Design a protein around this ligand. Sequence first.
Ligand SMILES: CSc1nc(N)c2ncn([C@@H]3O[C@H](COP(=O)(O)OP(=O)(O)O)[C@@H](O)[C@H]3O)c2n1
Ligand SMILES: CC(C)CCC[C@@H](C)[C@H]1CC[C@H]2[C@@H]3CC=C4C[C@@H](O)CC[C@]4(C)[C@H]3CC[C@]12C
Length: 392
Amino acid sequence: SLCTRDYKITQVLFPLLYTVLFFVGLITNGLAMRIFFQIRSKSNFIIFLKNTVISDLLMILTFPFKILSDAKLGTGPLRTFVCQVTSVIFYFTMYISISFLGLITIDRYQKTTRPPKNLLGAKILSVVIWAFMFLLSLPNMILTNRQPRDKNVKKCSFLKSEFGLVWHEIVNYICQVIFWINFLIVIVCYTLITKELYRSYVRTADLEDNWETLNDNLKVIEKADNAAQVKDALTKMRAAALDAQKATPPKLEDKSPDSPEMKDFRHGFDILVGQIDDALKLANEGKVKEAQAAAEQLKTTRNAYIQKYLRGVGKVPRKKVNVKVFIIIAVFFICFVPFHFARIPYTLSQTRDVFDCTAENTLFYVKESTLWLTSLNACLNPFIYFFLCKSF
Ligand SMILES: CSc1nc(N)c2ncn([C@@H]3O[C@H](COP(=O)(O)OP(=O)(O)O)[C@@H](O)[C@H]3O)c2n1
Ligand SMILES: CC(C)CCC[C@@H](C)[C@H]1CC[C@H]2[C@@H]3CC=C4C[C@@H](O)CC[C@]4(C)[C@H]3CC[C@]12C
């Protein structure tokens, strides 16, 4: 009552910040709807991605009501409407987005491990997420039935009934659980994909160590003047080559044993081992120069091409680098983590008259600032689909 909140910086900074996000958001999701809704829903990912684009658009359409109500220093019918309807829509569509981001992450993680009634399952799941958030949101709209007694007081908590304040606390608790379960899912999925990347790296580095062994021992043969040194190097080269021939590099992981990719990889080593074997036979006969000339045959255009090819097959592919799961984890840390940290103390100040005026106002400014970061997601989310061959 006696407490005053300074809205002079709020009425210039936030409507200006949200106006930018409204136009940036309309053009981003407009050029996402007209593209993604043309393509068919043949996978769960695209079903989840289509739900994400419309939940983004619903929360962007919420911004004009906010911009113009926050532009006014005092309360009014529009501020009451924001409190009761449009800002409630913002929150329930925000947790719809977080739910589908958690689902997209599970989907994308399961695709990395991978060597219709599931579309139905994804569709029913999509309906259940929307209906559930709507179920929680509806009493918040209905229990914001009180009129503002002081025209200078714009806080939604003063427009609420006793059970309205109770439900507000319950809803904000459930949403904290929805956030942290989805954040945990994203953290786990990211850690498992990152472990797989590090595992793919060591298998490539082990394989490349074999090539270094073979090429280092070839240098020894060139600078040698005796059959004992040539035989030693040739033996280590044969062992490195036969070791490398037994490997299943990340590019050959999901390939059939009788597939041409698997066959060319093994045959490439048979040609190089064969050349080492011919040079080793000569080294055993004490013919140093002849064994050096035959080992030097690995430097021919043909055998250098065979090496370059086999080494290329051993490299870590794009599949192992998941930019979609990294973007989602980046989005949770930037857009959602600060708001969810700022929320509980702010909810506590709204449901009980326990904090000092300046303490309350500080909690408001922090939640208002972090809520804006949360709104970037609606303008960021289409970039999970924007970086692929379909959009060039
Ligand atoms: C599932 S729907 C949902 N989820 C939340 N986490 C919510 N947190 C707040 N709301 C509602 O959205 C409206 C605005 O609440 P706040 O943003 O807490 O109010 P102000 O800081 O005073 O602008 C109120 O009717 C709240 O009950 C929420 N609604
Ligand atoms: C008042 C509130 C609860 C209204 C919610 C509207 C709901 C019913 C809407 C919003 C987003 C929609 C989804 C958008 C995209 C797809 C993918 C498509 O392959 C099948 C339908 C499906 C799965 C839609 C079904 C209906 C849907 C879940």
